[PDB]
Amino acid sequence: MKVVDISKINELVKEGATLMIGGFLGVGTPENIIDEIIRHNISNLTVIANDTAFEDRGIGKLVKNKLCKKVIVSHIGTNPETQRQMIEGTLEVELVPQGTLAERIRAAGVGLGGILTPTGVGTVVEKDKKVIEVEGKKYLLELPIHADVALIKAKKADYLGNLVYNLTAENFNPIMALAAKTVIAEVEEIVPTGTLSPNEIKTPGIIVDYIVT
Amino acid sequence: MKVVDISKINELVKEGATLMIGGFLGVGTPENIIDEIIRHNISNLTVIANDTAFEDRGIGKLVKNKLCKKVIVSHIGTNPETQRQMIEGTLEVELVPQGTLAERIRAAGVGLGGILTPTGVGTVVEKDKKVIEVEGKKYLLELPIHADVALIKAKKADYLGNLVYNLTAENFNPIMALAAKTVIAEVEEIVPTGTLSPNEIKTPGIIVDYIVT
Amino acid sequence: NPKEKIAIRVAQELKKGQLVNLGIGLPTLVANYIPKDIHVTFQCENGIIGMGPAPKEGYENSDLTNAGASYITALPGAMTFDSAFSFGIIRGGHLDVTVLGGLQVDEEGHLANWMIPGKMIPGMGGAMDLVTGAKKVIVAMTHTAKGTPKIVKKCTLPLTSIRKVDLIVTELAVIEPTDEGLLLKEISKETTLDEVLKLTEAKLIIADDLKIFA
Amino acid sequence: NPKEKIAIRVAQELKKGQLVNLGIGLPTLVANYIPKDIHVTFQCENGIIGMGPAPKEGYENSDLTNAGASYITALPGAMTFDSAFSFGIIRGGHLDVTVLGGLQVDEEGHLANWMIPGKMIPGMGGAMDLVTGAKKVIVAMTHTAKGTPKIVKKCTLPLTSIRKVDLIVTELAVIEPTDEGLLLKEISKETTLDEVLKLTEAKLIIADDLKIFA
């Protein structure tokens, strides 16, 4: 079955894992999964997410306990500890424009080999990218981003693992659900099959491997 | 005011227009808008769609009345009149793998310059495509598809033009809504704002220009 | 009967919990023969996970069809979605099995199944994405076309994909394409090995544990 | 009060029916001065169309915030969505206006607003997508950084985009980048043209009908 005790994170999230973690500044983030990673000091992580939240919450807890070797994110400005580790050189930070980050994760999830975006052209983001012109306009070729495990947060799952989200807690979660090899969803409520309509489900249960909370 | 009488289609769709039309074999297709085009002999059209449906319905009616100069579709096998006009040379047919069609329309809707797909590599679809290798795997560069007007079908619109879809009538409609310059939505029901929740709306009213019933 | 033979054997290949896509024609018969203990979920490219059987008369919904526009039911827990999401499932590796019809399959495991120049020109639809992206591709086809072998050294009809399909099931044979060529794993109880090889233009590797079944 | 001056003038630039995105900080004040006869809708990159003002105490929802994680309301008819859809709106030309803060703008109309080497390194977030994609980009920014001009001949700080922004509004001036260079359109009632020119390093073209306002 899909629902597992939170201790199962230790079997599924390896030391050194590459992880996609949902949440925008900690909103819609799998807090209980993060707390278990902290409890067992699972480190050397590469975390792909919008941001490193704040020092006191979400992904910021992972940075505070020095569990990330690398973050691939669009924003770190609300976490001075992330910036301090970056400047000291103990944390590698790869900054990705937020829209590009979404499309790069999505490309991995939907089976594309890359996307062309005008975002970042002529900025430092262009460094080490293939530039492709189409119809006289320049685009950066941006490449799919893969991960071992997606750690996502959802409002409800039905008995089959179909997920719905709530308001601005959706953000990166359904995109990362498609893109990682294994998907673990932290959910606030389990509801009967038939409570979530075919027209409203946003992540089908077939792609959700494990559920906690 | 977005809602207009259906008889205004002749004012909004010009001869020679490039149109995206929603629907999978006539399911989720704007049948009343199509009937207006037929009634007013709006001809020389280029139609981007999954298919040309059947001779008796949907986009098939446009082909039956010889109103298309060109179709850009993934499938024509259920319409022998499309096949006959293709063979006789009076209708240009551009076949696009269905998943590629979805992503090429989407790319125009979301501002990408193109996408890389493995679909079609080593087939006749590779002809006249840039091939890009990424991590030792070959992809076809597929380019955004633009249109003058999207003719889409939806289940309900609220007073602000927010749209929901129903079951397998969704197909290409919300993608096309993002991709064309002007968007006309045929809907079955107008409902009060607040009937469609923020968590279930699939197309925001801000991108819908006109609505017909 | 040969179509039943094939559909029964293909059904036996499906595993509990898989997401499966059935092409139009012979593959759709597979749903008629799923062993009773085996629970799978079906995807249709027009935008559903959780396709069910045709509705009883009067229970049809105009917005709920398969990829031939025939009325279907949706089972509890189904999800419907747009065509981009649909081909994200298909191209993205989230579809466990696709069962597709065939015109030819060759010794490289390449499938031709969408066009016969000068005859059938339906377009490819989703077939190229499905062969390219499904975790497993099963080709369910008759062994010959009115006597002409369909399992050939190199496809002469237009390829659907350069992906190597994973299994071919005919009324005579079960064949697995491998790096070494085509491995004949089973033949029908109603044929002989020689009859199978005579009706196959491709070279076959004969498994040392050849089995009888379908 | 310089921030209020800017926010008031930017709000007067907005047109009925527009979808508008406000950056955090100075641009967020714009929402407090919308002319009563003007109806716009606000988008936040974290995934909402229909952002409303901060909730009354006790009406907060943990899942409903702006792009700074501050609680917001959602107005009737709002839509929430994932980050891919969000940047499809932003990058795809569906956002009428973005109002963003600024560190420098130069005579090419190029904006630098996400990094000061050796000083502030917050990352770019959505700013590069917003400047690249919005139909109209308005930079709302004080005229100088403690006396140092921020409207310069060529940016020395990292660029957010090579797109030419459409309007600069400071507490002293309203400037429109054009193909000829920066066109000064208005100056503040509380300043003088001489002071504006003393505090602008970039070359400025002067409109014939220079106005007073902000």
How far is it, in rounded angstroms, from Cα B116 to Cα B138?
Answer: 9
Chain A residues in contact with B174 by the CB 8 A cut-off are: none
Those of residues 26-55 in C touching chain B at CB distance below 8 A are 44-48
Residue C147 burial class via C-beta count within 10 angstroms: exposed 0-12, middle 13-18, buried 19 and up: exposed
Tell me the CA distances in angstroms from C81 to A198, B96, B130, one per residue in order: 8, 20, 30
* Closest of D123, D130, D167 to residue D44, by C-alpha: D130
| Tokens (6 digits) for C178 | 């491998």
Q: Are A115 and B111 inside 8 Å of each other by CB?
A: no
Residue B193 burial class via C-beta count within 10 angstroms: exposed 0-12, middle 13-18, buried 19 and up: middle
How far is it, in rounded angstroms, from Cα D128 to Cα A124?
Answer: 11
- C120 touching B (Cβ < 8 Å): yes
- D22 touching A (Cβ < 8 Å): no
Q: How far is A47 from chain D (nearest CA, A)?
A: 16
Helix (H) or strand (E) holding A177: helix A173-179
The answer to whether the Cα torsion of D68, D74, D75, D79 is positive or negative is positive
- A132 touching C (Cβ < 8 Å): no
Chain A residues in contact with B163 by the CB 8 A cut-off are: none
Tell me the CA distances in angstroms from B205 to A167, A197, D159, one per residue in order: 17, 22, 33
Nearest chain A residue to C87 by CA distance is A110
Residue from A206, A207, A210 whose CB has the most chain C CBs within 10 Å, to mutate:
A206
What is the CB-side half-sphere exposure of residue B193 using CA atoms within 13 A?
A: 12
- A199 touching B (Cβ < 8 Å): yes
| Tokens (6 digits) for A73 | 């994110």
| Tokens (6 digits) for A63 | 């940075």
Find the DSSP H helices in C14-148. Answer: 83-91, 127-133
The domain ranges of chain B are 6-114+143-212
How far is it, in rounded angstroms, from Cα A60 to Cα A25?
Answer: 9
How far is it, in rounded angstroms, from Cα C166 to Cα C27?
Answer: 15
**Number of A–C residue contacts, CB under 8 Å:** 49
Q: Are D133 and B158 inside 8 Å of each other by CB?
A: no
Q: C2-42+95-213 — its CATH code?
A: 3.40.1080.10
What is the CB-side half-sphere exposure of residue D81 using CA atoms within 13 A?
A: 22
Tell me the CA distances in angstroms from D136 to A20, D18, D46, D162, one per residue in order: 33, 11, 20, 14
**Number of A–D residue contacts, CB under 8 Å:** 143
Beta bridge partners of B71: B47, B93
Size of chain D, expressed as the number of residues it contains: 214
State the helix-helix crossing angle for D83-91 and A98-110, rounded to 10 degrees: 120
| Sequence-distant contacts of D198-203: CB under 8 A, at least 24 apart | D199/D143, D199/D144, D199/D147, D199/D149, D199/D172, D200/D143, D200/D149, D200/D151, D200/D173, D201/D149, D201/D151, D201/D152, D201/D153, D202/D105, D202/D106, D202/D107, D202/D149, D202/D151, D202/D152, D202/D153, D203/D107, D203/D153
Alpha-carbon dihedral D191, D197, D198, D201, rounded to 10 degrees? 130
Helix (H) or strand (E) holding B36: helix B31-39
- C83 touching A (Cβ < 8 Å): no
Q: How far is B200 from chain A (nearest CA, A)?
A: 6
* Closest of B80, B88, B117 to residue B101, by C-alpha: B117
Beta bridge partners of C175: C168, C184
The answer to whether the Cα torsion of C97, A180, A110, C64 is positive or negative is positive
Tell me the CA distances in angstroms from C212 to C5, C8, C13, C61, C177, one per residue in order: 13, 14, 15, 43, 18
Give Cα C162 distance to the centre of its chain. Answer: 16
How far is it, in rounded angstroms, from Cα C114 to Cα B5?
Answer: 42
| Tokens (6 digits) for B176 | 């096309």
How far is it, in rounded angstroms, from Cα A167 to Cα D103?
Answer: 32
Chain C residues in contact with A193 by the CB 8 A cut-off are: 76-77
The answer to whether the Cα torsion of B142, B60, B31, C83 is positive or negative is negative
CB nearest to B193's CB, from D19, D76, D93 = D76
Chain A residues in contact with C91 by the CB 8 A cut-off are: 110-112
Fold (topology level) of A6-115+144-212: Glutaconate Coenzyme A-transferase (3.40.1080)
> Which chains pack against C, by 3+ Cβ pairs within 8 A?
A, B
How far is it, in rounded angstroms, from Cα D90 to Cα D99?
Answer: 13
DSSP-assigned states of every residue in D10-57: HHHH--TT-EEEE-SSGGGGGGGG--TT---EEEETTTEEEEEPPPPT
Q: Are B24 and C91 inside 8 Å of each other by CB?
A: no
The domain ranges of chain D are 2-43+82-213
Residue pair D49/D82 in contact (Cβ under 8 Å)? The answer is: no
Q: Are D129 and A97 inside 8 Å of each other by CB?
A: yes
What is the CB-side half-sphere exposure of residue B147 using CA atoms within 13 A?
A: 35
- C99 touching A (Cβ < 8 Å): no
Nearest chain B residue to C112 by CA distance is B123
Phi, psi of B161 (to 5 degrees): 90, 5
Nearest chain A residue to C48 by CA distance is A198
Q: How far is D213 from chain B (nearest CA, A)?
A: 31
Helix (H, G, I), strand (E, B) or coil at B64: helix
What is the CB-side half-sphere exposure of residue D175 using CA atoms within 13 A?
A: 36
CB nearest to C63's CB, from B51, B78, B169 = B169
How far is it, in rounded angstroms, from Cα C138 to Cα C131?
Answer: 9
- C165 secondary structure, DSSP code: -
CB atoms within 10 A of CB D212: 10
Residue C138 burial class via C-beta count within 10 angstroms: exposed 0-12, middle 13-18, buried 19 and up: buried
- B78 touching C (Cβ < 8 Å): yes
How far is it, in rounded angstroms, from Cα D139 to Cα B149?
Answer: 32
Nearest chain C residue to A209 by CA distance is C17
How far is it, in rounded angstroms, from Cα B189 to Cα C58?
Answer: 23
* Closest of C80, C88, C15 to residue C44, by C-alpha: C80
- What's the 3-state SS for B135-199? CCEEEEEECCCCEEEEEEEEEEEECCCCEECCHHHCECHHHHHHHEEEEEEEEEEEECCCCCCCC
Residue pair C78/A198 in contact (Cβ under 8 Å)? The answer is: yes
| Tokens (6 digits) for C5 | 């033979």
Residue D117 burial class via C-beta count within 10 angstroms: exposed 0-12, middle 13-18, buried 19 and up: exposed
How far is it, in rounded angstroms, from Cα C124 to Cα C127?
Answer: 6
Q: Are B162 and D92 inside 8 Å of each other by CB?
A: no
Residue from A112, A160, A191 whose CB has the most chain C CBs within 10 Å, to mutate:
A160
- B166 touching A (Cβ < 8 Å): yes
Instruction: Write down the CATH superfamily of domain B6-114+143-212.
Output: Glutaconate Coenzyme A-transferase (3.40.1080.10)
Phi, psi of A152 (to 5 degrees): -120, 160
Which one is catalytic: C4, C13, C45, C171? C45
Residue pair B23/B62 in contact (Cβ under 8 Å)? The answer is: no
- D84 touching B (Cβ < 8 Å): yes
> Which chains pack against B, by 3+ Cβ pairs within 8 A?
A, C, D
Size of chain B, expressed as the number of residues it contains: 213
Contacts of B173 (CB under 8 A, 6+ apart): B22, B23, B28, B152, B153, B154, B165, B203, C82
Does domain D2-43+82-213 correspond to CATH entry 3.40.1080.10? yes
3-state helix, strand, coil in chain B (%, to 5): 30, 35, 40
Residue identified by tokens 């009632």 is: D189
Contacts of A90 (CB under 8 A, 6+ apart): A66
How far is it, in rounded angstroms, from Cα A93 to Cα A113?
Answer: 23
Residue D45 annotated as catalytic = yes
Q: How far is D50 from chain B (nearest CA, A)?
A: 9
Beta bridge partners of D51: D74
Q: Are A194 and C77 inside 8 Å of each other by CB?
A: yes
Residue pair D12/D99 in contact (Cβ under 8 Å)? The answer is: no
The two beta strands, A190-191 and A210-212, are: unpaired
How far is it, in rounded angstroms, from Cα A123 to Cα C124?
Answer: 41
- B56 secondary structure, DSSP code: T
State the helix-helix crossing angle for D83-91 and B98-110, rounded to 10 degrees: 60
Q: Are D63 and A168 inside 8 Å of each other by CB?
A: yes
Alpha-carbon dihedral B114, C43, A101, A63, rounded to 10 degrees? -160
How far is it, in rounded angstroms, from Cα B187 to Cα A90?
Answer: 56
CB nearest to B206's CB, from D19, D88, D133 = D19
How far is it, in rounded angstroms, from Cα C188 to Cα C168?
Answer: 13
Nearest chain C residue to B82 by CA distance is C122
How far is it, in rounded angstroms, from Cα B9 to Cα B12?
Answer: 5
How far is it, in rounded angstroms, from Cα B178 to Cα B210?
Answer: 14
Beta bridge partners of C113: none
Which one is catalytic: D45, D107, D108, D171? D45
- D108 touching A (Cβ < 8 Å): no
Residue pair B187/B152 in contact (Cβ under 8 Å)? The answer is: no
How far is it, in rounded angstroms, from Cα B132 to Cα D118?
Answer: 38
- B25 touching C (Cβ < 8 Å): yes
Residue pair A187/A39 in contact (Cβ under 8 Å)? The answer is: no
How far is it, in rounded angstroms, from Cα B169 to Cα B188?
Answer: 12
Q: Are D77 and B206 inside 8 Å of each other by CB?
A: no
* Closest of B98, B94, B192, B106 to residue B150, by C-alpha: B106
What is the CB-side half-sphere exposure of residue D42 using CA atoms within 13 A?
A: 25
Helix (H, G, I), strand (E, B) or coil at A11: helix
- B171 touching C (Cβ < 8 Å): yes
Tell me the CA distances in angstroms from B99 to A117, A201, B102, C45, one per residue in order: 20, 21, 5, 9
Strand order in the sheet with A68-73: A92-95, A68-73, A45-48, A18-21, A147-154, A180-187, A210-212
Tell me the CA distances in angstroms from A87 to A76, A83, C183, one per residue in order: 12, 6, 58
Residue pair A66/A74 in contact (Cβ under 8 Å)? The answer is: no
Alpha-carbon dihedral B138, A100, B147, B140, rounded to 10 degrees? 0
